[PDB]
Amino acid sequence: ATTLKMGMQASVGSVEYNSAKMLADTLEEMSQGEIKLALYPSAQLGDDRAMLQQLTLGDLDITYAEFGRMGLWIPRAEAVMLPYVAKDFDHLRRMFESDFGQGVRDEMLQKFNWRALDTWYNGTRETTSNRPLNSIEDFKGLKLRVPNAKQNLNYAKLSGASPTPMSFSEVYLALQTNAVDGQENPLPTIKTMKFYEVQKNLAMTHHIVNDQMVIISESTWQKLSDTDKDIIQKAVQKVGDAHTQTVKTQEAELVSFFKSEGINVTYPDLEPFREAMQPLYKEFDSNIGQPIVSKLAAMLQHHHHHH
Ligand SMILES: [Co+2]
């Protein structure tokens, strides 16, 4: 009997939690009850940084972490979270699977005892506002609320908007009174926070593409049998396929929902946004001493291929 422990920030009822339960059920089935998964939701074991440390120490078996979040530990990995580098999740997954991604994953394993098993799509951030954003030119004068995060700030600044720091629980009222003109977040968050009640427009800016890696402690991995390793890897990939499709499906449902609420949904040309980020890309590559971002942004050879 092997009961793995999996920690996550997400709450019961969330997509992330539902996928973890699907993983538990899939492991049970595939192992005829030999592999179990116990779930520790709602950051009860700490935030992602804390749970990742538990993996390093061998005290927790599995957790979620974003590929770009590895930039905190492995500086070059931040390249994947610069705005507009990843065109979409497929592109991000290609980065994960590339020689670049393999190198980052090897370092995660060697230094921190993190074995990345898979990357799962977890949504794309989009931009709401009190006036239509038909193109990058419309960002001029836009008081755009972003979280206190470097890359979100760069998105706001380089698009030509006026970045406007502000506490998340205050945003609804700031949008309502036009103290701030817009904000940027994933579609489910926009729904949950009812930002659509106080924002007449939504722009499909696709500026930040999110994922979640599934990481297992190398301490745990090395105790598993060869066959159990394969079962876990394949269980994670199966659940990953389901998770990614669920997130994609829910995003399309959310766009339709917002339209049904009377929201004006725009699809601005994104090439000018990518062009506007070039200062940032060149700075990143210059500082790190390798053409990391330019290579990743252009890594489109297998884009949308069936593998
Ligand atoms: Co291909």
Author numbering: 1 to 307
Original authors' sentences:
The first step of this process is the transport of sialic acid to the cytoplasm, which often takes place using a tripartite ATP-independent transport system consisting of a periplasmic binding protein and a membrane transporter. In this paper, the structural characterization of periplasmic binding proteins from the pathogenic bacteria Fusobacterium nucleatum, Pasteurella multocida and Vibrio cholerae and their thermodynamic characterization are reported. The structure and the thermodynamics of the binding of sugars suggest that all of these proteins have a very well conserved binding pocket and similar binding affinities. While the C1 carboxylate has been identified as the primary binding site, a second conserved hydrogen-bonding network is involved in the initiation and stabilization of the conformational states.
Vc-SiaP was crystallized without Neu5Ac and we determined its structure to 1.45 Å resolution. These crystals belonged to space group I222. The structure was refined to an R factor of 0.18 and a free R factor of 0.22. However, the r.m.s. deviation between the open form of the Vc-SiaP structure and the open form of the Hi-SiaP structure was about 0.9 Å. Interestingly, a Co atom mediates the inter-protein contact in the crystal lattice. Given that there was no cobalt in our buffers, we propose that this came from the TALON column used in purification. Interestingly, the binding affinity of Vc-SiaP is 309 nM, i.e. ten times weaker than those of Fn-SiaP and Pm-SiaP. The structural features that might contribute to the low binding affinity of Vc-SiaP remain unclear.
